Amino acid sequence: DISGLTPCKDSKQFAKREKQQIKKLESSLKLYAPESAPALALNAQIEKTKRRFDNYGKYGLLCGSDGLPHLIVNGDQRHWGEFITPGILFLYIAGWIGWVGRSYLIAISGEKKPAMKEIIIDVPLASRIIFRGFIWPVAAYREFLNGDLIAK
Amino acid sequence: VFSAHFGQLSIIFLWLSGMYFHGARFSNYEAWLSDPTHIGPSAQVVWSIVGQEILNGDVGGGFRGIQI
């Protein structure tokens, strides 16, 4: 489809790899008794492998010539969830962390010896500050417009 | 110095107790006792969280675990 790739629900190397893995597991399964705990563990492993392959096929990925899925970070609308959808999420969480830390530092800048508050964290003020990062984009944008983000 | 020596002895005893309990609970000692030549000792079992279950190799005697 894109860059000479094959849809993952149509390629044959995917099925061949699945068969190889299943046979490799079943070779070890035969050794033990069918009712024994290792048999149950190996059956669970086989079920997990089958579910993973089915999910990968149903999710609309694209295997390559050799048989493995390929990620597309290009920006096509059919792969929103491949890179772009997770990435934004990360930024959100990441921003949270940063924002919170910055706030805490300012919250201890007033006192005469902030080093004691840096090496021994206090829990009440930190817990007050932690949940303010849930709306970090709005506060950050307002501070940028006001001009309090950058020192002078 | 005396107090530090006592603490070190306590840590060593805890380590020995842990080794013995692992031998008692997650091990194949009884299988190895009958046929020692064809069975590999093993006293650690890995969980099945991510795909690390492949670390539970077949040492022998109807057991899977890391060979010690």
Partner: peptide, 11 residues
């Protein structure tokens, strides 16, 4: 020996 292995996979 089976029970010892099963103790890890109880859940």
């Amino acid at each position: 020996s089976g029970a010892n292995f099963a103790r890890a996979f109880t859940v």
